[PDB]
Scaffold this active site. Structure first.
Site, short mmCIF file in Angstrom:
data_model
loop_
_atom_site.label_atom_id
_atom_site.label_comp_id
_atom_site.label_asym_id
_atom_site.label_seq_id
_atom_site.Cartn_x
_atom_site.Cartn_y
_atom_site.Cartn_z
N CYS A 1 -10.36 -13.94 4.08
CA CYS A 1 -9.34 -14.14 5.14
C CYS A 1 -9.17 -12.84 5.93
O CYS A 1 -9.27 -11.75 5.33
CB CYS A 1 -8.01 -14.65 4.57
SG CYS A 1 -7.99 -16.46 4.48
N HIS B 1 -0.20 -14.35 6.07
CA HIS B 1 -0.07 -14.82 4.66
C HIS B 1 -0.42 -13.68 3.68
O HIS B 1 -0.24 -13.89 2.47
CB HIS B 1 -0.81 -16.14 4.46
CG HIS B 1 -2.29 -16.05 4.50
ND1 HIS B 1 -3.07 -17.02 5.12
CD2 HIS B 1 -3.14 -15.14 3.99
CE1 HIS B 1 -4.34 -16.70 4.98
NE2 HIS B 1 -4.41 -15.53 4.30
N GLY C 1 -10.46 -13.80 -0.49
CA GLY C 1 -10.61 -12.40 -0.05
C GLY C 1 -11.26 -12.29 1.32
O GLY C 1 -11.24 -11.17 1.90
C1 LIG Z 1 -9.10 -16.80 3.09
C2 LIG Z 1 -8.58 -16.15 1.82
O1 LIG Z 1 -8.98 -15.03 1.51
N1 LIG Z 1 -7.66 -16.79 1.06
C3 LIG Z 1 -6.96 -16.14 -0.04
C4 LIG Z 1 -5.48 -16.11 0.26
N2 LIG Z 1 -4.95 -17.47 0.45
C5 LIG Z 1 -3.50 -17.45 0.74
C6 LIG Z 1 -2.73 -16.42 -0.04
C7 LIG Z 1 -2.22 -15.21 0.44
C8 LIG Z 1 -1.43 -14.53 -0.52
C9 LIG Z 1 -1.57 -15.11 -1.79
BR1 LIG Z 1 -0.98 -14.43 -3.43
S1 LIG Z 1 -2.40 -16.61 -1.73
C10 LIG Z 1 -5.68 -18.12 1.54
C11 LIG Z 1 -7.17 -18.15 1.26
#
Ligand SMILES: *CC(=O)N1CCN(Cc2ccc(Br)s2)CC1
Ligand SMILES: *CC(=O)N1CCN(Cc2ccc(Br)s2)CC1
Lengths: 304, 304
Positions: free
Chosen positions: A145, A41, A143
């Site tokens: 993740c 993601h 942040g």
């Molecule tokens: C666990 C974590 O850091 N986050 C932030 C990101 N979110 C999904 C996304 C990735 C790219 C975008 Br723009 S939003 C999951 C939770």
């Protein structure tokens, strides 16, 4: 003496944490040999996250779009691929701090240490368990993740978890390092409800043993029970059924304390039926279920 | 979301742990620059520990009697001295893994991370607090002595604790890195009883704020109180008196949640007076007092 919720020393994993940026999304990656592992993601815009087609989104990305920074030094990306829900970024430099490591997929009830990281920088370390509903109860802000869960056997880091998402109920879902989610969870912003958070019975019994070993004994009673009788009480209180496998695993703690597993089961049964009447066990007012029998032995015997 | 008892990443401290042996006693030492710090009771025979004269015992020891091993490599001891209850062993090699560091003496109520070690090898990491009675509630077996407590401010490790002894009640006493014991404790096997383990009120309030920030709100009520009124309740329940200094420190958590400190005090007062009626707060059935206001801010804001 004393018994504490204890994480593995995190140094070996600290040496593997990097920052990964694709477009304007920054999260953490795991640098082992010449590969950096991160949640797929990272390629999404929050827009994308409602119904992302990762294969189609990835076609728009080139090696040079994946910005990988280990401390203040940039790594050169020479390859990228998707494996399930993780990206593997091939870099031109083997991580010189790569520990001996394995990738393992843990079962529910197994514990591990999390190194919470932000922008590839470690913030802290805590101990977790894979819940029977395949969630974990973590501490993860935006942040975080790509933060990883791990166990250490002497010199070998077994990575078991990469953080991917928070459910609206405030609990955490993620993958093993092959990018397969624990439980039914998907990397999509959707209706994902956790099932019953059942208590890990074998762990509670392990922790009752740890309590006895450290002088907390008020909850020992004159009673015994059977697996079938105990299991009627476990059902009622949303405890995992106890199996002969669990009894066998508690064998060494049984042998050391001289308290038969089914006698400790009878203690646990009275605690379930009567609560702790305002008393505490190893500084807790509830039954702790995120120590494994292996964790209790390790901590009680000073293994390094 | 989620709030966890979180230790600092331990890598920077792992790099400082060595084994110290004098005669047949092995414990841990801390290698910073060209000095190794360890408990002075390393020179004792269990015999000695009833009424040891450390100055007289040390006269019988030479540099070559102190066996210092960093992993599998021996360090050459070129000097030794006693400072209060610690030995400083001068070695011929600066620790190449020396982090930026300070020695600080913490006040009761302050939290720190412990890296439990055995024979100079790290076993695990957990979070502690200096109790108001100057004990800590650790996890320390024989061989754990010389394990250290620390805080990290970005890149600088502030060492605050070295482990020296277990009281017969299963709680822990030790020194700062100048070798001065916290509280009245001595490195002698004698009658040493801990005073009242009072609850760290400001920390409980910090943790109630953390709970609200993470969606646990059932304990907010329609009430307020005063410092003097609250303090009558704190006295009754062996809680530290709350000062304006404590209110000032809770200012940022107040500002973020919009719950006035004295309103949160009134919540805490009802919890003390009525208990949790079988409910939980951030997965605890008792009031947690080993998170500082600084700890709650750090974890709630993802500081690295
Ligand atoms: C666990 C974590 O850091 N986050 C932030 C990101 N979110 C999904 C996304 C990735 C790219 C975008 Br723009 S939003 C999951 C939770
Ligand atoms: C904390 C710890 O490891 N120990 C073991 C050592 N003990 C005091 C002694 C030192 C030398 C001998 Br022989 S006994 C304190 C607790």
């Amino acid at each position: 003496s004393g018994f504490r919720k204890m994480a593995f020393p995190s140094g070996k994993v600290e040496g593997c944490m990097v920052q990964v940026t694709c477009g304007t999304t920054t999260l953490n990656g795991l640098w082992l040999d010449d590969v950096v592992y991160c949640p797929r993601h990272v390629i999404c815009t929050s827009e994308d996250m409602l119904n992302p087609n990762y294969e189609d989104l990835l076609i728009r990305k080139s090696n040079h779009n994946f910005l990988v920074q280990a401390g203040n030094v940039q790594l050169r990306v020479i390859g990228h691929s998707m494996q399930n829900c993780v990206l593997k970024l091939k870099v031109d430099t083997a991580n010189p701090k790569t520990p001996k490591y394995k990738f393992v997929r843990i079962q529910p009830g197994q514990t591990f240490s999390v190194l919470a990281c932000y922008n590839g920088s470690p913030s802290g370390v805590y101990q977790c368990a894979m819940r029977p509903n395949f969630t974990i109860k973590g501490s993860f802000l935006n942040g975080s993740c790509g933060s990883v869960g791990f166990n250490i056997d002497y010199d070998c880091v077994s990575f078991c978890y990469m953080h991917h998402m928070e459910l609206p109920t405030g609990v955490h879902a993620g993958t093993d390092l092959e990018g397969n989610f624990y439980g039914p969870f998907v990397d999509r912003q959707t209706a994902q409800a956790a099932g019953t958070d059942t208590t890990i019975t074998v762990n509670v019994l392990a922790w009752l043993y740890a309590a006895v070993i450290n002088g907390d004994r008020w909850f020992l009673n004159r009673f015994t029970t059977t697996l079938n009788d105990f299991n009627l009480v476990a059902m009622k209180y949303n405890y995992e059924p106890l199996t002969q496998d669990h009894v066998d695993i508690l064998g060494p703690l049984s042998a050391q304390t001289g308290i038969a597993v089914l006698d400790m089961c009878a203690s646990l049964k009275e605690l379930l039926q009567n609560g702790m009447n305002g008393r505490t066990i190893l500084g807790s007012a509830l039954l702790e279920d995120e120590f494994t029998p292996f964790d209790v032995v390790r901590q009680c015997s000073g293994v390094t």
